[PDB]
Write an enzyme that holds these catalytic residues in place. Structure first.
Site, PDB file in Angstrom:
ATOM      1  N   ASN B   9      23.021  66.618 -17.504  1.00  0.00           N
ATOM      2  CA  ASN B   9      23.141  66.304 -18.937  1.00  0.00           C
ATOM      3  C   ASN B   9      21.909  66.891 -19.629  1.00  0.00           C
ATOM      4  O   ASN B   9      20.815  66.314 -19.524  1.00  0.00           O
ATOM      5  CB  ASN B   9      23.206  64.785 -19.171  1.00  0.00           C
ATOM      6  CG  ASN B   9      23.275  64.412 -20.656  1.00  0.00           C
ATOM      7  OD1 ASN B   9      23.434  65.271 -21.529  1.00  0.00           O
ATOM      8  ND2 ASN B   9      23.116  63.121 -20.947  1.00  0.00           N
ATOM      9  N   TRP B  10      22.050  68.049 -20.299  1.00  0.00           N
ATOM     10  CA  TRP B  10      20.895  68.678 -20.970  1.00  0.00           C
ATOM     11  C   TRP B  10      20.385  67.907 -22.183  1.00  0.00           C
ATOM     12  O   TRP B  10      19.272  68.160 -22.656  1.00  0.00           O
ATOM     13  CB  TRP B  10      21.243  70.106 -21.412  1.00  0.00           C
ATOM     14  CG  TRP B  10      21.521  71.077 -20.299  1.00  0.00           C
ATOM     15  CD1 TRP B  10      21.828  70.792 -19.003  1.00  0.00           C
ATOM     16  CD2 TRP B  10      21.646  72.502 -20.434  1.00  0.00           C
ATOM     17  NE1 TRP B  10      22.067  71.961 -18.295  1.00  0.00           N
ATOM     18  CE2 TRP B  10      21.970  73.021 -19.155  1.00  0.00           C
ATOM     19  CE3 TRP B  10      21.462  73.388 -21.495  1.00  0.00           C
ATOM     20  CZ2 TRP B  10      22.132  74.385 -18.920  1.00  0.00           C
ATOM     21  CZ3 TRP B  10      21.618  74.772 -21.250  1.00  0.00           C
ATOM     22  CH2 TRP B  10      21.956  75.239 -19.984  1.00  0.00           C
ATOM     23  N   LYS B  11      21.206  66.992 -22.694  1.00  0.00           N
ATOM     24  CA  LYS B  11      20.913  66.243 -23.900  1.00  0.00           C
ATOM     25  C   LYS B  11      20.628  67.257 -25.031  1.00  0.00           C
ATOM     26  O   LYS B  11      21.223  68.352 -25.044  1.00  0.00           O
ATOM     27  CB  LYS B  11      19.810  65.225 -23.680  1.00  0.00           C
ATOM     28  CG  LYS B  11      20.099  64.313 -22.505  1.00  0.00           C
ATOM     29  CD  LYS B  11      19.117  63.144 -22.425  1.00  0.00           C
ATOM     30  CE  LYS B  11      19.421  62.246 -21.244  1.00  0.00           C
ATOM     31  NZ  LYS B  11      18.496  61.043 -21.228  1.00  0.00           N
ATOM     32  N   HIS B  95      27.533  57.441 -23.217  1.00  0.00           N
ATOM     33  CA  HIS B  95      26.155  57.505 -22.763  1.00  0.00           C
ATOM     34  C   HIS B  95      25.361  56.454 -23.519  1.00  0.00           C
ATOM     35  O   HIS B  95      25.612  56.209 -24.694  1.00  0.00           O
ATOM     36  CB  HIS B  95      25.543  58.870 -23.046  1.00  0.00           C
ATOM     37  CG  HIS B  95      24.240  59.095 -22.354  1.00  0.00           C
ATOM     38  ND1 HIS B  95      23.035  58.641 -22.854  1.00  0.00           N
ATOM     39  CD2 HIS B  95      23.959  59.691 -21.169  1.00  0.00           C
ATOM     40  CE1 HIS B  95      22.069  58.980 -22.015  1.00  0.00           C
ATOM     41  NE2 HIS B  95      22.604  59.621 -20.989  1.00  0.00           N
ATOM     42  N   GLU B  97      22.600  56.495 -24.950  1.00  0.00           N
ATOM     43  CA  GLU B  97      21.986  56.960 -26.195  1.00  0.00           C
ATOM     44  C   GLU B  97      22.981  56.879 -27.346  1.00  0.00           C
ATOM     45  O   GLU B  97      22.585  56.637 -28.490  1.00  0.00           O
ATOM     46  CB  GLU B  97      21.402  58.376 -26.009  1.00  0.00           C
ATOM     47  CG  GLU B  97      20.236  58.346 -25.016  1.00  0.00           C
ATOM     48  CD  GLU B  97      19.886  59.654 -24.348  1.00  0.00           C
ATOM     49  OE1 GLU B  97      20.498  60.708 -24.676  1.00  0.00           O
ATOM     50  OE2 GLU B  97      18.970  59.611 -23.467  1.00  0.00           O
ATOM     51  N   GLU B 167      24.344  53.815 -15.486  1.00  0.00           N
ATOM     52  CA  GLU B 167      22.987  53.995 -16.025  1.00  0.00           C
ATOM     53  C   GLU B 167      22.242  52.677 -16.035  1.00  0.00           C
ATOM     54  O   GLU B 167      22.566  51.817 -16.831  1.00  0.00           O
ATOM     55  CB  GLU B 167      23.019  54.416 -17.493  1.00  0.00           C
ATOM     56  CG  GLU B 167      23.734  55.664 -17.831  1.00  0.00           C
ATOM     57  CD  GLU B 167      23.548  56.013 -19.313  1.00  0.00           C
ATOM     58  OE1 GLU B 167      22.425  56.389 -19.713  1.00  0.00           O
ATOM     59  OE2 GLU B 167      24.511  55.895 -20.080  1.00  0.00           O
ATOM     60  N   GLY B 173      12.745  54.612 -17.691  1.00  0.00           N
ATOM     61  CA  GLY B 173      11.554  54.849 -18.472  1.00  0.00           C
ATOM     62  C   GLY B 173      11.062  53.552 -19.063  1.00  0.00           C
ATOM     63  O   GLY B 173      10.637  53.517 -20.231  1.00  0.00           O
ATOM     64  N   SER B 212      16.995  57.248 -12.820  1.00  0.00           N
ATOM     65  CA  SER B 212      16.041  58.305 -12.482  1.00  0.00           C
ATOM     66  C   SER B 212      16.199  58.776 -11.025  1.00  0.00           C
ATOM     67  O   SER B 212      16.057  57.990 -10.082  1.00  0.00           O
ATOM     68  CB  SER B 212      14.601  57.826 -12.745  1.00  0.00           C
ATOM     69  OG  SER B 212      14.391  57.525 -14.135  1.00  0.00           O
ATOM     70  N   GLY B 233      19.387  63.671 -16.029  1.00  0.00           N
ATOM     71  CA  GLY B 233      18.845  63.942 -17.355  1.00  0.00           C
ATOM     72  C   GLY B 233      17.829  65.076 -17.363  1.00  0.00           C
ATOM     73  O   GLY B 233      18.180  66.257 -17.169  1.00  0.00           O
ATOM     74  N   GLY B 234      16.561  64.715 -17.555  1.00  0.00           N
ATOM     75  CA  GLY B 234      15.466  65.691 -17.637  1.00  0.00           C
ATOM     76  C   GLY B 234      15.375  66.754 -16.553  1.00  0.00           C
ATOM     77  O   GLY B 234      15.081  67.901 -16.852  1.00  0.00           O
TER      78      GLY B 234
END
Ligand code: NA
Lengths: 255, 255
Positions: B9-11, B95, B97, B167, B173, B212, B233-234
């Protein structure tokens, strides 16, 4: 001396076959146009392909919306930085469909306007009153409020190079329509509102009519002095019809 | 017996330059991988470009969101028909977000799931509980509710060929972490919940871990029997870090 702009809002319509057919037909029908600027806003996933198809013509690209972040952990959002990167220039913000279906506030739309300006993009700020608002005699108050979200936070200078599109929402799916005299009255009010802050900026702002525009009624609308083009809906999807609108704007504003 | 899937997921991260570099580097880093499926979800305007750059690789395309209409007067929306047309297969919906920042309800997300199924696309249904829900011991209750929005309105066959991404928002985080044992307990619960309606559908659902994941915990996470991969994610923005996760998934299920 305002150079008109006719922009096609394709809304939720598109496919790879359709982009190729429609942009190719647009290139042909618009190849002899000099006196009117042209932009198209396909669905976001087709901006890149449409930009590639438009290379060699004067057809400019655009988009139908933008979000507030440039990058980060914002799954599913649209970045002004990426819109610039992919070749879009004219970015529609505050369209009635988004103000209604997606609850986008005047303040949110003004924030989008600011992000677009920081990126050197051209906001196409959509404003306009509903049926209930029109019935209450609130057309001017509503347009003023919507414009003020930008004007009172970012100054008149924010409208340099920008575009405003007036949408009489009260004429959507109601059977009704605004006359060219009615449309003109609103455009002159919008321009005069901006002129109260900066007359020079007001004289250069492109104010497009965003109600129903088609091959048949384009000429009568563009004959009005404060109508500088159109943000076209359904007629955007057929090259022949869209071309008649562009040529009508060209003819109405040329020397 | 489930073939694992690792999805990036590049967001809100991407550009012309970054798409060319990252996709090319991914194809190089993934050479020889055959035991783990790989998908990427770039920002919407780059799906077409990413698909072209992915030619000659085994990288599959996807997207980060979808809206409810296929076509029409819905300025700025995303159409499942157009995602299919552009070559996106795995479509992330719900998601965290978007559930948070865009207030997307369980009901809306279930409607997105339905439109995707109708088009023959693969939903990647994201579910998971918040910090407070986790502290209150409501993990299972929340996960069941988010799944039921689809299960109770569309039937267990809706999950044929579908993906679920868990998730652990409470741990992402936040200074707290989920162990592989803890992730496994949630995945098993999710699969057992679907199995109550249809055991055969439950055994073929791909349930990805969406917390993560790094090179240090990928092996232990992927050794868990009900964890079929990860929604990354990242790390999906760096070809080498993403490939390490893919290879760990491959190695774990081929152990
Ligand atoms: Na979007």
């Amino acid at each position: 001396m305002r150079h008109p702009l006719v922009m096609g809002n394709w809304k939720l319509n598109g496919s790879r076959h359709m982009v190729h057919e429609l942009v190719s037909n647009l290139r042909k029908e618009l190849a002899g146009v000099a006196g009117c600027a042209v932009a198209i806003a396909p669905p976001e996933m087709y901006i890149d392909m449409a930009k590639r198809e438009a290379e060699g013509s004067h057809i400019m690209l655009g988009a139908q919306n933008v979000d507030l972040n440039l990058s980060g952990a914002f799954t599913g959002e649209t970045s002004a930085a990426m819109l610039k990167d992919i070749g879009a220039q004219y970015i529609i913000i505050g369209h009635s469909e988004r103000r209604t279906y997606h609850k986008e506030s005047d303040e949110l739309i003004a924030k989008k306007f600011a992000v677009l300006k920081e990126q050197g993009l051209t906001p196409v700020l959509c404003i306009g009153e509903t049926e209930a608002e029109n019935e209450a005699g609130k057309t001017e108050e509503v347009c003023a409020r919507q414009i003020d979200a930008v004007l009172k936070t970012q100054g008149a200078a924010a409208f340099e190079g920008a575009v405003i599109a007036y949408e009489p929402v009260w004429a959507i799916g109601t059977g009704k329509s605004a006359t060219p005299a009615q449309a003109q009255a609103v455009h002159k009010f919008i321009r005069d509102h901006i002129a109260k802050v900066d007359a020079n900026i007001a004289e250069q702002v492109i104010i497009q009519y965003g109600g129903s525009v088609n091959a048949s009624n384009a000429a009568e609308l563009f004959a009005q002095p404060d109508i500088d083009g159109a943000l076209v809906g359904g007629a955007s999807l057929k090259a022949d019809a869209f071309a008649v609108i562009v040529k009508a704007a060209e003819a109405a504003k040329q020397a």
